Design a binder for this molecule. Structure first.
Ligand SMILES: Nc1nc2c(ncn2[C@@H]2O[C@@H]3COP(=O)(O)O[C@H]3[C@H]2O)c(=O)[nH]1
Ligand SMILES: Nc1nc2c(ncn2[C@@H]2O[C@@H]3COP(=O)(O)O[C@H]3[C@H]2O)c(=O)[nH]1
Ligand SMILES: [Mg+2]
Ligand SMILES: [Mg+2]
Ligand SMILES: [Zn+2]
Lengths: 821, 49, 816, 48
């Protein structure tokens, strides 16, 4: 009624308000003596505002609800600032571009939350540079446009869309750690021509509470998103590292396990072919014109895009995960065409309001019977470490109804990136499978080339002639009779004697002698060894040995023949059961199976695959592995009529036997054998020592190892007429290995291996006898007196070699003095 | 009725071709320090042992 | 002046006008920096004006640069004034190893105090367990507690009272909550004027904790968000290095633990790797069992193996980054001397140590480990789990960068890191499995290569260098080898090597090897490409040995296919379209077309799930033959392509790959209309010269022609004269009957009548159907293509006629 | 200092340390859909 007069007299108004108001008040006013706070109503206004902000703080403290608190703050700020209305603009980052979407619109001092809240489907998404609000967000500062007609940033999109006229605009960005949470905005100054600087100061200071509330909301959202990202990464890592599988299984496990942390109604994963090049019979139709070339879209790697399998994860309502092999182009995921574009470009596609999109033919409306409409889409390319797109993952309809923002983009990008790197696991798995299949094929080829064939077994088991049947058909008694009438007797060849020589017997005769040795031990009957299997296994062992100078089939029968003599003529079978003797003679046969003619040292120096697979005792472990694999074959498994415990003991005892043939291993454990031999002299008679030793396990293992290392060098303990010839073959093999060293490795061989130093062979043999064999054979002669001939023959051979070496030395000295001196 | 007088779509004042993000290739190997370290006899030598 | 009466008459208008014109100024002043004007030197009841001033002062601290400690301390000073209090304090809620702890962060806060005299460093905090104290009772009850007398309380502890020389009579405490987790506890110690804290003080505390609740909520949320972000970055960065390549455990662990060195926020951490040897070899267990050496004494893992850190990687980060590796670290090592890694390996328990020098269980160093005075204060050591629950290593993280002891968030972060590392052992183990499997495959491939390679004693059966010159073949000159071969190799005219009616029945396998060598000599590809003649002979003998000794697909079939290819090139005059290199490669492919055939077709390989079927997908046996032949050709002693150029070698290998793969009937059936189109195109041209000139330039048509020639040669047995076909067909039927018997026995499936041994009398009918179906098209099209291949068509026609006669006789016999 | 403690953090009860149990509870074909993830008559009559 007088408002204009109060305006024209600011001094009178200030004087009147500064008057001390009487204790009488108007309405409640929380009058704890508050009428005169330096002004008539400054005390009352202070009290009322303090109460209001305290209520706002109470609302903030429990059950954080940023919408309601921000709405109340805006409602009060509308009255304080005299603005016609206020609004709130949520900040989101889609596709790397900041966007400002409405969350509270047309807020008035007499409005309610329901009439001002903006649902996700009614958002006016202003980009970063298409409005004054965008300019505020970009500049990260307050903007006070006194008159907005001349503002170069103003956009009339919102006011035209909402049937409104905007004159003055005041806005500020809600700030949190250099991240714009939101942008409050007040428009249409109701009283004055524009918003004064005092109104600007009030806008800054009164918005600190809203700043705190939005900071809390943003921090909660960020913490939840980061927790979900950590959980999905950990769960994907757990399933990826569970085992080695293909792309499909690994991706399905990773994607299904983390379905709870994605908060998506639906998402589908499409898998692309990896065939870089088509084979010749597929290129022929295009070149010859019988078929047209593929002119469709291609990956950045110049690859055909063909989703060969799409895994569909439908999570809204009922969980009905589907797998679509060779999906049609009509598939609801592929029909939109977004996965194809993602494959073509390898981009990160974030689609808001999919039905309103123009580039992609998203479906018009309801997809399934439930009327689920695609609204927000985020598509991701799964790229391996080699920058190749393995597949495309697409997510639909975020469960909370909001579009996919930056946080969801990074959350799903971390998952897709982790799974893309996990393709190395699948590549390694498929290379494992390829290598295993190739090794199995090579093993089968070896088995064919080593196993005695159908025709070769008739040389030792003639049954198509004697009986007219194949060996697999004849009964055990028939084959036993055939072997008895075919196999040599124990006296035909002195297989029971330490002086056995193989220089006057054929290889077939050697195999027959091996079968006879098996029969002598009596292990064929008690263990029910299939006789045809025994003959086949021995022939296969004979074939498995190479055709090299020394380490051929003959050396490997002489190793096993010597062990047979040790067991039955040296009477060392007292400490060993029949099963142990059986498994111990078999290991004697597989002593040096597949020896390549080069020693263990050459394997390491030449960097053979053997040296990489084993490392220590290379060739011995290789022989053990080959023998065990050959025995694993059913047609050659003599250990097939054996108990599981018996078979395990046999195999175990074979491992010590074969490996102990290594000379380096023997040199490190011979003192233990010396101690064991010394224990024998402590006992009174042989019977007591037999009783004690036959029950010990480790001591029997040591004795068996030393028996191996004595049988290996048994060629020296042969009569001189045999040792002289055998040493020549040994020297020839070592000379061949030295020549191989000089040629391939370009290294000077040691004198024992040097073909040039052929005249030094007697001296080298004398040194070898004095160093290695002497200990073994002396200790064995001390242990068992029956092995004494194997020591006397060694001493005789040493004497002969010493005589030859002395003759060579005398010749060298005579040449040195008689002319050179 | 919504305070923004629009239903059924987040209408945008921007008319143009959509733009899409670039895949992050920030790497999100031996240059690591310490990488290098991670991976009577004469007669025996004479006789190839 | 008369207006002054009007506002007095109705003061509602005055209130409204003050709101319209001065409310904004009042709010701006109140929310300005300013200061509270409440008299803090007295104890008057709080006026609504003073209450509003206090509220605004508390709201003044709600700035963007939220210093949680300072704002909460200001709230405590105001609460000390309001509550008639003497002192107040705060206890941060920290979660150590399962047992929650409450450590003092603000202490002895009074109305005239400052942050400097109230802030508590991590080295001065008083950690309190959940069980003892009114603080612990408040934390467990999660509710406000008022103690009117400490003497009658059952939880009050005098520890702080004795440690601070203070007496507490009345206690009022309340917890600060974020959701349902306790964040901090605000407690009062003494009522200045009164028996205790009344209900009014309890209401004041609840009213004024809202600001403190919000500030603590902001601080807690920020810390948790930072921790979770760091965890995510650690996981992703470590996965990047884990999936960078396939390496051993040491390299992968070093990469993962060095790439995330910034995210761990630790001054120092060390990782010790345990030995994985569960069982020691027999020669190592012998001395222990024999008394030579004493057995292992002490620290043992739960898995049962000995604790032996064979390699320790220590990452020093407080000053100069000093990443170091200690192979076989001694017990004197600063990481292992404390014994915490050994204890963790013994137990497998996550250990968080606060104030390590004060601990007595472990002997932590109490002297400066570094020259800068670095101290071991807080330690966190954890195992590396592994998928088999086998402790493979121990990761120990020393003093935190910020100085605070490790809490539950740090435990969770490092536990996620160590769990990922333990899960990421499948790749290190698979790396060793890869290496061993590849080495084993190489070993067995060398074994098969030896078993099929012609040895030096078998090459003398043909290359008789020893008995002619006395030298080994590798020593004799090329001219000498040529002379020996000319003396030894047969005559093409005498053996009908370049005829379509060649029969291998009266020839030995060695004779066929010599004939095959003569085939290469006739094409004049030896001198042109300088093929080592010794290598040629050795490779031919290796091909002879490589073919299995099965019924039909023995080496005689391969030599027959090679002879057919040679005759097609020479007698059929198909060499016009092909170069010398292409002819050489084609002949080699023909000889290697069925190398190492098992005797069972592709369907049997697929049904039995043979490793061949799992390796090769489409053409199993043909791809296997191609691979084996190329491996045979890769040997230096067998490589006849060694003297070829790189382009020539690649073209030959490609051409062989096309030829051998096309030998299968499935590929021929699909790609046989192309041959008809090519023949029609040939007949379009006027003179043979123009067609030949067109063909020598086009490559796809040449490839298709050779692909058809491969199948024409593979079925050439039918085109042979009747006296040969009658036996070859029986051999083929015998092999297919063997495969059918194998199917019936192993696969337990009924064989097709073609492979059914019982239906042996139906062989003529099946052969007639075979001729009508597969071979007739090929041979008719080839005869139309070249009139010189007409004898092949005549032979197949005659064989079909005689097989039809036999089938008709059989059918007539079945009538009755 | 406010708490009268200069050396390090001080607890009233000092006994043997308690340590965490290693986390194992939280961490195949059980997942649905993994089952599916991993002129002609005479042709078969003649081996093909
Ligand atoms: N109807 C209405 N429009 C608003 C409101 N706040 C801002 N706008 C309008 O939304 C628009 C966003 O871009 P501008 O800032 O350039 O201009 C703004 C104003 O025109 C409001 O509270 N109510
Ligand atoms: N001198 C002093 N002692 C305190 C303070 N706050 C807590 N205390 C004491 O620390 C103690 C912890 O256990 P109680 O809760 O039973 O009792 C408490 C109080 O006696 C403080 O601010 N000053
Ligand atoms: Mg050996
Ligand atoms: Mg074939
Ligand atoms: Zn063939």
């Amino acid at each position: 009624q007088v408002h204009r007069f109060l305006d024209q007299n600011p001094g009178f108004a200030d004087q009147y308000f500064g008057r001390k108001l009487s204790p009488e008040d108007v309405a409640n006013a929380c009058e704890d003596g508050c009428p005169e706070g330096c002004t008539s109503f400054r005390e009352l206004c202070q009290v009322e505002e303090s109460a209001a902000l305290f209520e706002l703080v109470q609302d903030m403290q429990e059950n954080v609800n940023m919408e309601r608190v921000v709405f109340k703050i805006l409602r009060r700020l509308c009255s304080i600032l005299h603005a016609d209305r206020c609004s709130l603009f949520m900040y989101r980052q889609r596709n790397g571009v900041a966007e400002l979407a409405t969350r509270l619109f047309s807020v008035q001092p007499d409005s309610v939350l329901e009439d001002c809240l903006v649902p996700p489907d009614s958002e006016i998404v202003f980009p970063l540079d298409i409005g004054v609000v965008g300019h505020v967000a970009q500049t990260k500062k307050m903007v006070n446009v006194q008159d907005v007609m001349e503002c170069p940033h103003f956009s009339s999109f919102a006011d035209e869309l909402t049937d409104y006229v905007t004159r003055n605009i005041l806005a500020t960005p809600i700030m949190n750690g250099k991240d714009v949470v939101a942008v409050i905005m007040a428009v249409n100054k109701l009283d004055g021509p524009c918003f004064t600087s005092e109104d600007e100061d009030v806008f800054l200071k009164y918005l600190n509470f809203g700043t705190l509330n939005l900071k809390i909301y943003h921090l909660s959202y960020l913490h939840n998103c980061e927790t979900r990202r950590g959980q999905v990464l950990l769960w994907s890592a757990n399933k990826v590292f569970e085992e080695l599988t293909d792309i499909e299984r690994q991706f399905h496990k990773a994607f299904y396990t983390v379905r709870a942390y994605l908060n998506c109604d639906r998402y589908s994963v499409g898998l692309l072919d990896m065939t870089k090049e088509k084979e010749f019979f597929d290129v022929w139709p295009v070149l010859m014109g019988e078929a047209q070339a593929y002119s469709g879209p291609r990956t950045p790697d110049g690859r055909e895009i063909l989703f060969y399998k799409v895994i569909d994860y439908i999570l809204h309502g009922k969980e009905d995960i589907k797998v679509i092999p060779s999906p049609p182009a009509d598939h609801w995921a592929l029909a939109s065409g977004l996965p194809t574009y993602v494959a073509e470009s390898g981009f990160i596609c974030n689609i808001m309001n999919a039905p309103a999109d123009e580039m992609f033919n998203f479906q018009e409306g309801p997809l399934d019977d439930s009327g689920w409409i695609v609204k927000n889409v985020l598509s991701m390319p799964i790229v391996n470490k080699k920058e190749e797109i393995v597949g495309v993952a697409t997510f639909y309809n975020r469960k909370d109804g909001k579009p996919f923002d930056e946080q969801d983009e990074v959350l799903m990008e971390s998952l897709t990136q982790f799974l893309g790197w996990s393709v190395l696991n699948t590549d390694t798995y498929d290379k494992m499978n390829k290598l295993e299949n190739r090794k199995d094929i090579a093993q089968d080829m070896v088995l064919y080339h080593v196993r005695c064939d159908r025709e070769e077994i008739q040389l030792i088991l003639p049954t198509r002639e004697r009986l007219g049947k194949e060996p697999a058909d004849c009964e055990e008694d028939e084959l036993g009779k055939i072997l008895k009438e075919v196999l040599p007797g124990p006296a035909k060849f002195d297989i029971y004697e330490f002086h056995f020589s193989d220089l006057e017997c054929t290889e077939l005769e050697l195999v027959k002698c091996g079968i006879q040795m098996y029969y002598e031990l009596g292990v064929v009957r008690k263990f029910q060894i299939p006789q045809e299997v025994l003959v086949r296994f021995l022939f296969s062992v004979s074939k498995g040995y190479r055709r090299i100078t020394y380490h051929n089939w003959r050396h490997g029968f002489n190793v096993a023949q010597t062990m047979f003599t040790l067991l039955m003529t040296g009477k060392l079978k007292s400490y060993y059961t029949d099963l142990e003797a059986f498994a111990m003679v078999t290991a004697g046969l597989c002593h040096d199976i597949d020896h390549r003619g080069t020693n263990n040292l050459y394997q390491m120096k030449s960097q053979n695959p053997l040296a990489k697979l084993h490392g220590s005792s290379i060739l011995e472990r290789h022989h053990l592995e080959f023998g065990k694999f050959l025995l694993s074959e059913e047609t050659l498994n003599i250990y097939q009529n054996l108990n599981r415990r018996q078979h395990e003991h046999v195999i175990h005892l074979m491992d010590i036997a074969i490996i102990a043939t290594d000379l380096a291993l023997y040199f490190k454990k011979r003192t233990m054998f010396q101690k064991i031999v010394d224990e024998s002299k402590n006992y009174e008679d042989r019977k007591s020592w037999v009783e004690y030793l036959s029950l010990e396990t480790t001591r029997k293992e040591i004795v068996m190892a030393m028996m191996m290392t004595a049988c290996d060098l048994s060629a020296i303990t042969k009569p001189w007429e045999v040792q002289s010839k055998v040493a020549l073959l040994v020297a020839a093999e070592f000379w061949e290995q030295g020549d191989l060293e000089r040629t391939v490795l370009d290294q000077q061989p040691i004198p024992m291996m040097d073909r040039n130093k052929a005249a030094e062979l007697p001296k080298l043999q004398v040194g070898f006898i004095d160093f290695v064999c002497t200990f073994v054979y002396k200790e064995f002669s001390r242990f068992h007196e029956e092995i004494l001939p194997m020591f006397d023959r060694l001493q005789n051979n040493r004497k002969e070699w010493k005589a030859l070496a002395d003759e060579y030395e005398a010749k060298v000295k005579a040449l040195e003095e008689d002319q050179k001196k | 009725r919504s305070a923004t007088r629009v239903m059924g779509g987040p209408v945008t004042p921007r008319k143009g071709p959509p733009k899409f993000k670039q895949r992050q290739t920030r790497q999100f190997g031996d240059d690591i320090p310490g990488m290098e370290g991670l991976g009577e006899l004469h007669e025996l030598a004479q006789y190839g042992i | 002046e008369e207006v002054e009466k009007f506002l007095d008459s109705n003061v509602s208008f005055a209130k409204q006008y003050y709101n319209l014109r001065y409310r904004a100024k009042v709010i701006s002043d109140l929310l300005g920096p300013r200061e509270a004007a409440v008299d803090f030197s007295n104890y008057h009841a709080l006026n609504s004006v003073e209450e509003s001033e206090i509220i605004f002062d508390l709201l003044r601290d709600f700035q963007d640069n939220l210093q949680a400690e300072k704002c909460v301390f200001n709230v405590m000073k105001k609460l000390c004034f309001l509550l008639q209090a003497d002192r107040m304090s705060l206890f941060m809620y920290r979660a150590r190893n399962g047992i929650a702890e409450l450590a003092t962060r603000l202490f002895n806060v009074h109305k005239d105090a400052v942050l400097e005299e109230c802030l508590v460093a991590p080295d001065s905090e008083i950690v309190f367990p959940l069980d003892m104290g009114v603080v612990g009772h408040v934390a467990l009850s999660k509710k406000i507690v008022n103690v009117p007398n400490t003497e009658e309380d059952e939880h009050f502890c005098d520890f702080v009272d004795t440690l601070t020389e203070y007496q507490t009579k009345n206690i009022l405490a309340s917890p600060i909550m974020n959701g349902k987790d306790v964040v901090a506890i605000i407690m009062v110690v003494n009522k200045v004027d009164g028996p205790h804290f009344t209900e009014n003080d309890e209401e004041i505390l609840l009213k004024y904790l809202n600001f403190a609740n919000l500030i603590m909520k902001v601080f807690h949320l920020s810390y948790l968000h930072n921790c979770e972000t760091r965890r995510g970055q650690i996981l992703l960065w470590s996965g990047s290095k884990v999936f960078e390549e396939l390496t051993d455990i040491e390299r992968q662990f070093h990469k993962a633990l060095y790439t995330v060195r910034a995210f761990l926020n630790c001054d120092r951490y060390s990782v010790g790797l345990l030995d994985m040897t569960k069982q020691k070899e027999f020669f190592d267990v012998w001395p222990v069992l024999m008394g030579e050496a004493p057995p292992y004494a002490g620290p043992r893992t739960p898995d049962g193996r000995e604790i032996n850190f064979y390699k320790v990687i220590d990452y020093i980060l407080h000053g100069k980054e000093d990443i170091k590796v200690i192979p076989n670290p001694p017990p004197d090592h600063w990481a292992l001397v404390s014994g915490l890694p050994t204890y963790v390996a013994q137990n497998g328990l996550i250990c968080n140590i606060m104030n390590a020098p004060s601990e007595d269980f472990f002997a932590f160093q109490k002297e400066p480990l570094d020259e800068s005075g670095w101290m071991i204060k807080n330690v966190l050591s954890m195992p590396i789990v592994n998928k088999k629950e086998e402790i493979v290593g121990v990761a120990t993280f020393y003093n935190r960068k910020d100085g605070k002891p490790f809490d539950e968030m740090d435990e969770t972060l490092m536990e996620s890191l160590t769990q990922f590392l333990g899960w990421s052992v499948l790749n290190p183990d698979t790396y060793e499995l890869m290496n061993k499997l590849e080495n084993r495959k190489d070993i067995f491939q060398d074994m098969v290569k030896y078993h099929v390679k012609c040895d030096n004693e078998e090459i003398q059966t043909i290359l008789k260098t020893r008995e002619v010159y006395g030298k080994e073949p590798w020593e004799c000159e090329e001219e000498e080898l040529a002379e020996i071969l000319q003396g030894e190799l047969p005559d093409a005219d005498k053996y009908e090597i370049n005829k379509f009616h060649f029969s291998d029945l009266p020839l030995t396998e060695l004779e066929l090897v010599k004939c095959g060598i003569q085939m290469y000599y006739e094409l004049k590809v030896v001198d042109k490409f300088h093929i080592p003649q010794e290598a040629l002979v050795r490779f031919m003998y290796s091909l002879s040995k490589g073919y299995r000794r099965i019924t039909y697909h023995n080496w005689r079939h391969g030599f027959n296919v090679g002879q057919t290819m040679f005759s097609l090139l020479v007698t059929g005059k198909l060499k016009r379209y092909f170069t010398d290199l292409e002819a050489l490669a084609m002949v080699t492919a023909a000889f290697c077309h069925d190398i190492d055939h098992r005797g069972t077709n592709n369907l049997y390989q697929m049904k039995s799930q043979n490793p061949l079927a799992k390796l090769h997908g489409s053409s199993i046996l043909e791809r296997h033959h191609l691979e084996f032949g190329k491996t045979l050709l890769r040997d230096e002693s067998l490589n006849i392509f060694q003297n070829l150029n790189r382009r020539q070698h690649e073209h030959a290998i490609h051409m062989m790959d096309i030829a051998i793969i096309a030998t299968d009937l499935a590929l021929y059936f699909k790609k046989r209309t192309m041959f008809q189109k090519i023949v029609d195109q040939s007949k379009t041209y006027e003179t043979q010269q123009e067609w030949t000139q067109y063909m020598m330039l086009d490559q796809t048509r040449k490839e298709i022609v050779m692909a058809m020639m491969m199948t024409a040669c593979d079925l050439s047995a039918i085109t042979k004269p009747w006296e040969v076909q009658s036996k070859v067909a029986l051999l083929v039927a015998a092999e297919f009957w063997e495969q059918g018997d194998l199917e019936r026995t192993v696969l337990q499936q009924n064989p097709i009548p073609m492979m059914d041994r019982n239906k042996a009398d139906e062989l003529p009918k099946l052969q007639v159907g075979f001729i009508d179906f597969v071979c007739t098209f090929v041979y008719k099209e080839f005869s139309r293509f070249h009139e010189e291949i007409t004898p092949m068509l005549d032979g197949i026609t005659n064989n079909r006629k005689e097989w039809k006669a036999l089938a008709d006789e059989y059918e007539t016999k079945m009538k009755g």
